[PDB]
Amino acid sequence: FSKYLSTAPVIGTLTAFFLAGLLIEINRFNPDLLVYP
Amino acid sequence: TQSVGEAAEKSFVMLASVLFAGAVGGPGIKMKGQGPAWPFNAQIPFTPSEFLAVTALGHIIGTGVILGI
Amino acid sequence: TLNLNAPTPIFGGSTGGLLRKAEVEEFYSITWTGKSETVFELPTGGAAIMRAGENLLRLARKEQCIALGAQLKDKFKITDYKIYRVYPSGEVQFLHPKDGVFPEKVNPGRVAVGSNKRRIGQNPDPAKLKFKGQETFDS
Amino acid sequence: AHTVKIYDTCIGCTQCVRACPTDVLEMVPWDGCRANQIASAPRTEDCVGCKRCESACPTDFLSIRVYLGAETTRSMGLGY
Amino acid sequence: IGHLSTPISNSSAVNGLLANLPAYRKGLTPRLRGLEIGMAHGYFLTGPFVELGPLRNTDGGILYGSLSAVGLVVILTACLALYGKANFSGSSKSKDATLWESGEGWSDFVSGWLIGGAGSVGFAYLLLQYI
Amino acid sequence: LSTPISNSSAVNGLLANLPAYRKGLTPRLRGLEIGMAHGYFLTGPFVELGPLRNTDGGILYGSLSAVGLVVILTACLALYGKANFSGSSKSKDATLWESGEGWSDFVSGWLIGGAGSVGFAYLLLQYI
Amino acid sequence: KIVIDKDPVSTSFDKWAVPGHFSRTLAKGPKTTTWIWNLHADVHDFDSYTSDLEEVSRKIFSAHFGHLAVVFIWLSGAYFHGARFSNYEAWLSNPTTIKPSAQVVWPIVGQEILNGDVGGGFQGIQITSGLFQMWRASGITTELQLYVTAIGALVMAALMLFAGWFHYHKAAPKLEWFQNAESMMNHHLGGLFGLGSLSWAGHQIHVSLPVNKLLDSGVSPQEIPLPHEFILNKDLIAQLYPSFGQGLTPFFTLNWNEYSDFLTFKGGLNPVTGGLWLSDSAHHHLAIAVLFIVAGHMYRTNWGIGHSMKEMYDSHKGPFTGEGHKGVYEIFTNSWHAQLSLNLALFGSLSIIVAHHMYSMPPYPYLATDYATSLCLFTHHVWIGGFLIVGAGAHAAIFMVRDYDPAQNYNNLVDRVLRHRDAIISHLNWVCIFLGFHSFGLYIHNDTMRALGRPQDMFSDAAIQLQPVFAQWVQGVNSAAAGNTAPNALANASYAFGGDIVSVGGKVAMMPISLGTADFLVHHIHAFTIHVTVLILLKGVLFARNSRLIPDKANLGFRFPCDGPGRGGTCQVSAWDHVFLGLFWMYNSLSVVLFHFSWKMQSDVWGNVTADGAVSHITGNNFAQGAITINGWLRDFLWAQASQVIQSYGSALSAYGLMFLGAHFIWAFSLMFLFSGRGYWQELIESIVWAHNKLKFAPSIQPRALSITQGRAVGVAHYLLGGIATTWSFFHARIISVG
């Protein structure tokens, strides 16, 4: 079953998921990261 | 009728109706060519017997359109 | 030899075929023998019927008498077809098969017209034939 | 008419000849080995320039090449 | 064949108008069969100009309107003669030698067209402005 | 008499597949579905139109008239048995209706089916 | 007869690792990067690889169940979000002021201004899909009922997806079962369509009609009894329209006039709610029930009787048609593509009728005066409706290349259409050009006479009039039918033909849409652009096999980019390019229909009515003397009514203004693909794959250009997405502000 997870589009969205998932919690955590403090 | 008369523009409706009749009433006549022929023996592609009917049919259709508008 | 008139297939139709060019210049025709009574799509619309025949049909152009044969031989297994191009208003009778054998097959006696004895990057440059009437791609 | 040139890289595969929609090309006996065959264009006056031929040559860079030239009634495919 | 066999192709009552119009007719000379065309197309062409024009409600609408109707015909007999120079290069002989295949009477067609193409035009201006 | 509703496939389906023309059924059972059919709607007129309709008692008495015609119709189905089949004379076809061959139970298959219909159809209008 | 293969293919995750396992050439591996685009096109192109007419059908029968599932998932998504994240329970208390809101935004980086002050006690995006008026019509009062539907849909969503597994991987039917079209029409009319409206009559009488008659009196959403209480309690329901005390007994003695109270023919607008009287729609769906059930006992089955369609098409043949419909039944049992084209045409054309019959006869309470929603169900279903007709033109052409057979079809109607296909197209070509001159050229005439200051010369109402006398006689005879030819109707079929205006709240539900010189002028533009979209699509179907130019277009396939630059050039000769071409014309055909509709309603029909009795409309009757020229179409419609979409910044409409720019972006991006070609963009890879080879990391899948058709297909797919989503954003942020 896990060989289906290795294919191109499922890994082109689940790594697109957590990477977009990282930007979104850190903005909810730390709003307006405009300048390096 | 901006350049003509009010009882003059009926004549276009009546004379079109004779052409509207004979264009589709003309090819419906089955036995054509029965006499009499034209007055001066003018060899013309219909008969006066037939053409009198088209002017009669045109006079009925034209009465229907003129009173219809 | 055309054998005009050979009996055309029983058709009755087609606004799309053999118009006024055929009565001023160069119409076409194709001859074959039908080995059944099967139906086929014409290049005009689709049906005629293949006769016993003697089956002739004045098509429009060369491309339609060639594409009919590549449709005939596959579907109906008949490789007897003999295309033409007409008398007075046309140019050369019997345009295919020009050798009597099919010219996709190889045959002794033919001429190698239009051969360049090189590669295509090995053609001369068009900077080298400036104001010279020699064609760049020609030997 | 269009010019159809056949280069000496032909491998006598016959693919080109069987691709032409107007029967412009044919295979002819080659003398460099007297076993293989090369394509020829004896009827270039009927070439429409569709380029179906060049799409059939297998060799990495064409053995048959179509250089569009003077247009005519026949080459334009007019049924009219 | 070449054409199609409907039940209404080549029907008689439309062929009776077809082979008796003054362009497909039998015996008319090309000076004269262009007149019956020019008498035909001219009489109605002053229709649209005089009730649909820039000025319609003036002295003045039929008069000026009908100048453009003969003013159209003169662009048509021009277009007839440029067809004559370009289709009949010396009236090159063709399969029928009609008025239309091989020329032979084209400037008699052209001059015949302009007679009714001015004659029938003002006749309606007579019939519209007067009568 | 050959056109068109004596000859159509819509009727020759429906004519043959009724239990007077069906081949497979038996005279107790093809007199039953005949009995079940005519008996079922026979309660219909009386419970709506009778000697008394606006009563309790309009469906009881209406269904009681309904089995009344049936017990005369057992007798009429048996007097077509006692007259047309006298000595059990055969004929050139000998189906159920040509000669008898099943008639003694066919008169009761109506009786089971007809009065079994009004006993069925009483609890639809008056009850439930 | 029902014949089955049992488990032809089992449950394996092993084929999921091989993409292109369905096909032949793609179950070997990619060598270029187009193999991805070679794959992803012909996935659901089922007869491209499969040769088996029975097996190609079993895939389609399964995949429809999955498509039945994804709507049910999407339906539950509407029904779930209708309970938790909606102001629905508050909206039933007050339908006039509070806007229907769902899809609440999360409180993050700045999209929390999209949860604006919509009403109630609520913050969300104001929606315009009309589920609130579809649940108020359905009888929904509590928010629990919206929850149990969603799980009730989700179990049907799961049941549909299992049924697609059960009928291909477990129990595959055969082709002799599939080809039984007569028994299929018997059930689909009978079961699906007969018992469709009967069951909805079974809903609407016992459920919708009580609780919607009470809300017209409007006692309370809480004080309306639950929908199961009107079946249990016999006294509670028979308080209103008291025929339930008579029960089913007038229905069973054929004295049907005793139900003249809930099963009626009122026929107007319900003046408190502006919608259709739900009493009528109960009688409608009841008459639709009996009409469709007796429609379903018509075709032949294994009980002898019925009409058989192979018998009906034969002996429907006349002297102008030769063989008539001989073999046309044999087409629609032997070709899915011929079925999909005809199924698509009357499916899109059906939905444009839905868009027309919903703004002029508003079916729902408080959908008519809510101009946010009564617009958006016109323009959505119109937009769906044009895309299906283009799909109807596509699969009609696909039938011609791959499925049409001239062996069976001799001298019948597909033969005689193909044997006169120039007379169709060239007369269609003429009537296209005739319509463009005498409709669009009447605007260019009207543009100039206003530019030259000659308003006595333009085509207007105070000018040379072009009066629509046929559409005013039809609008007359339909508005004078309640009482003459439809006596039992109280008012007319609609108030769009004639009659008095109706108001709900302070806004107009319906008023007679009038048709003058400016309405004649636009209705012929519709007639023009539809005839061109026909002409592109009809020529693609007819010349799909051959033409004069190419005699073997049927051999080159349905979707081949060109035949090269021969014969002067043969770029876009294929039937697919005709469907590609007709897509913009359908974009042009429909976007002017919406521009006709959304402007005619705001200036003439919709608006605020005084308590004195007259109506001041929104854009102020400008459609008479402004809509006859392009500058009036540009200024007074496009420039003026987009003043609220670009001023949307800082408000809760500010997501619409981004999309109104965001769709302007994608539409520009599509121009890059339509205006360019392949052999430029391929040779820019050659310099760039040089550079990725230069640093020793080059991909083994070598990159290539997109195919020309994929360059064409991405050029139209971004064109429509850029063009419709502009209109989607314009129509939203106009009518949410001024309505």
Ligand code: CLA
């Ligand atoms: C740039 C050169 C030019 C000029 C000077 C004009 C001038 C005119 N055009 Mg315009 N027009 C032009 C180019 C031009 N046009 C082009 C290029 C187009 C295509 C876009 C148009 C499309 C157009 C339309 C649709 C119409 C005009 C009309 C008019 C006339 C308005 C006033 C009028 O009718 O008085 C009233 C006087 C008359 C009608 C009679 C005036 C004299 C006529 C034209 C000639 C009489 C016969 C003459 C002896 C011989 C023929 C003349 C010919 C050989 C030049 C005016 C004569 C209108 C019109 O009335 O058409 C006639 C009109 O409907 N034009």
Ligand code: CLA
């Ligand atoms: C016969 C046509 C027909 C019409 C005009 C209606 C009309 C209506 N339906 Mg109903 N319905 C029908 C049949 C119809 N129904 C059928 C066959 C089903 C089972 C699939 C349903 C199941 C149903 C449900 C579940 C609901 C409705 C609702 C409604 C109302 C909402 C508006 C709408 O649906 O758009 C109008 C639709 C059309 C104009 C297109 C008609 C489509 C059918 C298939 C046409 C059949 C062809 C017909 C013989 C010839 C007409 C051709 C063309 C003129 C339409 C409206 C009164 C809703 C409601 O209750 O509102 C209060 C609702 O919730 N309908």
Ligand code: CLA
């Ligand atoms: C706004 C830009 C535009 C315009 C004006 C046109 C025009 C046309 N398209 Mg085209 N089309 C367009 C964009 C446009 N298209 C785009 C973007 C695409 C890509 C999808 C296409 C793809 C397309 C296809 C696939 C087809 C068309 C066809 C047509 C013709 C339709 C018939 C017609 O109305 O003739 C009448 C002409 C007009 C209405 C043009 C305006 C003429 C004005 C009003 C009158 C002229 C004034 C004056 C006399 C001019 C000369 C003055 C001077 C001599 C002094 C028409 C010429 C179709 C066709 O050819 O059918 C036969 C067809 O099949 N087009």
Ligand SMILES: CC1=C(/C=C/C(C)=C/C=C/C(C)=C/C=C/C=C(C)/C=C/C=C(C)/C=C/C2=C(C)CCCC2(C)C)C(C)(C)CCC1
């Ligand atoms: C309704 C209709 C129709 C009709 C229409 C048309 C066809 C029309 C046309 C008409 C026309 C179109 C007419 C004509 C007329 C003309 C006239 C009547 C004129 C006159 C002329 C003249 C008079 C001339 C002469 C002259 C000259 C040449 C010069 C010298 C002097 C003069 C002046 C003498 C049809 C059948 C289709 C169909 C049905 C419907």
Ligand code: SF4
């Ligand atoms: S020209 Fe091309 S196809 Fe023809 S023989 Fe040579 S290599 Fe083969």
Ligand code: SF4
């Ligand atoms: S260009 Fe086309 S027609 Fe000419 S030889 Fe090549 S394939 Fe044949």
